[PDB]
């Protein structure tokens, strides 16, 4: 009995109820990005980099 | 009994309830990127990145 | 019995109620970035830089 | 154009999302009456007694 | 145009997220009644009596 | 245009979201009445006696 990566809960979303009530909902894009309506979302990475919002960066190495 | 990896929960989601009522929903995207509506969802990445919104970027290695 | 990784929660988000009341919701990008409602996420990073909220950086290494 | 009996909506029920997770449910009755999990139910009378929960009642009109 | 019984909503349960999480759950009737769990009910009655929990009575009109 | 009744909400529950997080749950009765755990219900009634929590009247009328 040791138990080294014993009962762990990591990275967990539970027991969300949520109600949306909306008439209208627009978007325009013309450029970049655009990141709406993330609900209940769970992640884990191991030696990585985690994102769950973008990286919106033009990235412009030139030359 | 060591348990090394023993009964984990990660990146999980669970016991979700939604109710969505919209009237009118509108994306319009003229470049670049949109991201909208992402939902119970969960990812376990080992040894890589791991992403829940884009990466939106206009990668112009030039030259 | 010594327990390293014992009974954790880390990155951990439950038992959550909303209720969203709007008419109307508007967003219009015209460049860089927009992130909007980020509801109920988790995340465990391990050896990475964990993002929630975007970069946003228009990342010009030029020459 | 008179509308007398026009666009209604009455005892109605929409737009239900549940989510039960229960491990052990019992009901042990012994006598009268048990009603359970009653979800989304809609009803709508003219000249008579609606019910949605029981009478539950011994009538015992003797003699 | 007139409208008497125009664009009504009555007796309307509508939009309702819920999540339960129990893990026992036990009910023990002897005897009466008993009521449990009602979610999202609706009812309309005319020239009725109407009832959403239980009458519970033991009516013993004797002799 | 007279509009008698006209856009009406009687009785109406709406956008609600809940989230119940119980590990036991006991209901033990043995005489009379009980009633639990009624969310999000609507009535309407005309001409007659509207209930939604119990009678649990003992009507004991003798001889």
């Keep these: 009995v040791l138990y080294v ?14 109600v949306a009530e909306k008439t209208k909902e627009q978007v325009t894009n013309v450029g970049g ?5 993330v609900t209940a979302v769970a992640q884990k990475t191991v ?3 985690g994102s769950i ?3 919106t960066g033009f990235v412009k190495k030139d030359q």
Tied chains: 1, 2, 3, 4, 5, 6.
Excluded: N
């Design 53 to 55: 919002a973008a990286a």
């Design 47 to 49: 030696e990585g980099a």
């Design 33 to 37: 990005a655009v990141v709406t309506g």
């Design 5 to 18: 990566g014993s009962k762990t809960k990591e990275g967990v979303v539970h027991g969300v109820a949520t």
